[PDB]
PDB file of C-alpha atoms in Angstrom:
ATOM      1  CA  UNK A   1      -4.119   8.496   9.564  1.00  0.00           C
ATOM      2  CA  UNK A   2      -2.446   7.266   6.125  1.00  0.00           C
ATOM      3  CA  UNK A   3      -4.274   4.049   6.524  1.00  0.00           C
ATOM      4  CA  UNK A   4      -5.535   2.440   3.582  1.00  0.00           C
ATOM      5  CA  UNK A   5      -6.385  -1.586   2.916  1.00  0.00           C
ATOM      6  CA  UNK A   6      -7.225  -3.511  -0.360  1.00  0.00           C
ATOM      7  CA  UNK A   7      -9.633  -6.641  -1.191  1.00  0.00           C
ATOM      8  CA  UNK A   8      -8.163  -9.396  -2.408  1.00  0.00           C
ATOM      9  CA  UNK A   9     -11.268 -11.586  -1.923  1.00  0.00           C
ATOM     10  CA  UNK A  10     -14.777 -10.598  -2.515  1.00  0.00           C
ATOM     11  CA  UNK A  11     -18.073 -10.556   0.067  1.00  0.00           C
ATOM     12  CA  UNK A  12     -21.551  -9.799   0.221  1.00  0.00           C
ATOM     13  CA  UNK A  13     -23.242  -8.015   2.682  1.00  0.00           C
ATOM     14  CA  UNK A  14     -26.320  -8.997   4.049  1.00  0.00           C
ATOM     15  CA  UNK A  15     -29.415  -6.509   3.782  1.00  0.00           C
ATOM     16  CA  UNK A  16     -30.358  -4.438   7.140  1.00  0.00           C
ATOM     17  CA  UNK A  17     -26.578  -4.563   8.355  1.00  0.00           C
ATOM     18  CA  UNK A  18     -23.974  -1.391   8.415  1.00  0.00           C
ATOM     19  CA  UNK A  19     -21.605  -3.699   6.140  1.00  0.00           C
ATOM     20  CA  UNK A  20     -20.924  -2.408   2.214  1.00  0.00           C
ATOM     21  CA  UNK A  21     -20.482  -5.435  -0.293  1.00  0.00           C
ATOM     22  CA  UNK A  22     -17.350  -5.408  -2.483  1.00  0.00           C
ATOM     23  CA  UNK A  23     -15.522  -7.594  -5.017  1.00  0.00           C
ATOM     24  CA  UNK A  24     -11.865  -8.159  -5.446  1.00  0.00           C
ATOM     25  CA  UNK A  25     -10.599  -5.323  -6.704  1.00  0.00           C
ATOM     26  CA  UNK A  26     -11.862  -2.307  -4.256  1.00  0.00           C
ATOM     27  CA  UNK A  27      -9.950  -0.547  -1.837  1.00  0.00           C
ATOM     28  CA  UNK A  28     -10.978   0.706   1.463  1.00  0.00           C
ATOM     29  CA  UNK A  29      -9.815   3.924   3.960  1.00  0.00           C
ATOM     30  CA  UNK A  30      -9.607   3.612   7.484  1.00  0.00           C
ATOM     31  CA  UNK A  31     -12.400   5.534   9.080  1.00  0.00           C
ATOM     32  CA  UNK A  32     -12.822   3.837  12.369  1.00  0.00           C
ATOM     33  CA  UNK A  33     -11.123   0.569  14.486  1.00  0.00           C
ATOM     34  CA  UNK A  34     -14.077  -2.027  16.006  1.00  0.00           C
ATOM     35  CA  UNK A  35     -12.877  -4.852  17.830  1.00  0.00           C
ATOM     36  CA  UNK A  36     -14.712  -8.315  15.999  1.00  0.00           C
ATOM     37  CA  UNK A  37     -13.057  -8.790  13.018  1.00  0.00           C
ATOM     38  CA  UNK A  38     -14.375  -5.668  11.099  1.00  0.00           C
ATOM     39  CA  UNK A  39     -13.492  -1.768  10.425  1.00  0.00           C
ATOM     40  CA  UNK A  40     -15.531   1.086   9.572  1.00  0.00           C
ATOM     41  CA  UNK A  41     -14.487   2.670   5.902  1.00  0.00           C
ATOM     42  CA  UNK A  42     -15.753   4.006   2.893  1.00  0.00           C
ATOM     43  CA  UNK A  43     -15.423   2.026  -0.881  1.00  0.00           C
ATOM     44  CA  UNK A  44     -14.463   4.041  -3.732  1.00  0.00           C
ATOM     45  CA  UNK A  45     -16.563   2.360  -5.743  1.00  0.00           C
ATOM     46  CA  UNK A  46     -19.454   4.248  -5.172  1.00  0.00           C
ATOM     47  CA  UNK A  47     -18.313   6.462  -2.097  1.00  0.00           C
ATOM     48  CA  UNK A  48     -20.302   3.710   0.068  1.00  0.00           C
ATOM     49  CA  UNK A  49     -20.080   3.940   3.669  1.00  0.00           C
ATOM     50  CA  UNK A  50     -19.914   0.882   6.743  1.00  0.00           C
ATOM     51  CA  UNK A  51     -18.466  -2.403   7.680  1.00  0.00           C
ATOM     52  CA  UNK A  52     -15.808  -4.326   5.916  1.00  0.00           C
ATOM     53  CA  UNK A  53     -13.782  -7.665   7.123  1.00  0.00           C
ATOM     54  CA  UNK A  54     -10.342  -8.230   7.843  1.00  0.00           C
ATOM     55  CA  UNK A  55     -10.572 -11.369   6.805  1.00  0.00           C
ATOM     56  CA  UNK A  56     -10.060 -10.936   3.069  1.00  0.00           C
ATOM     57  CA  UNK A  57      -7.647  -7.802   2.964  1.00  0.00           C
ATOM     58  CA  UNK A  58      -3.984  -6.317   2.496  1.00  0.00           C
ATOM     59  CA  UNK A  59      -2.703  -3.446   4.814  1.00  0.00           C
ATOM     60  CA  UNK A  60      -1.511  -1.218   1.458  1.00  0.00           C
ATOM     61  CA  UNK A  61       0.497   1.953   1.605  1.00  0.00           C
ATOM     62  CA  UNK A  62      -1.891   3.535  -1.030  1.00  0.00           C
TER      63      UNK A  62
END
C-alpha cells in the first residue's frame, strides 16, 4: 500500500456511474487497480467512494 495520487485538473462525474466528481485540489488513496484508464479510491473531501481518472493526476508520496 502507501499509494496516494493528487488532482491537478478537475472532472465531473456523470449521474448513475461508480465515478466521484472532484476539483483541482483533492487527493485520492489507492483502493483498487482497473485496467481502462480509471482506479477505485476514496476523496477526502467528503469520504466519497468510486471511480477516478488517470488522466488528470500526480502519483504523490503523501
Amino acid at each position: 500500500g502507501r499509494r496516494r495520487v493528487r488532482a491537478i485538473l478537475p472532472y465531473t462525474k456523470v449521474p448513475d456511474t461508480d465515478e466521484i466528481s472532484f476539483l483541482k485540489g483533492d487527493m485520492f488513496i489507492v483502493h483498487n487497480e482497473l485496467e481502462d484508464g480509471w482506479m477505485w479510491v476514496t476523496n477526502l473531501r467528503t469520504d466519497e467512494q468510486g471511480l477516478i481518472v488517470e488522466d488528470l493526476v500526480e502519483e504523490v508520496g503523501r
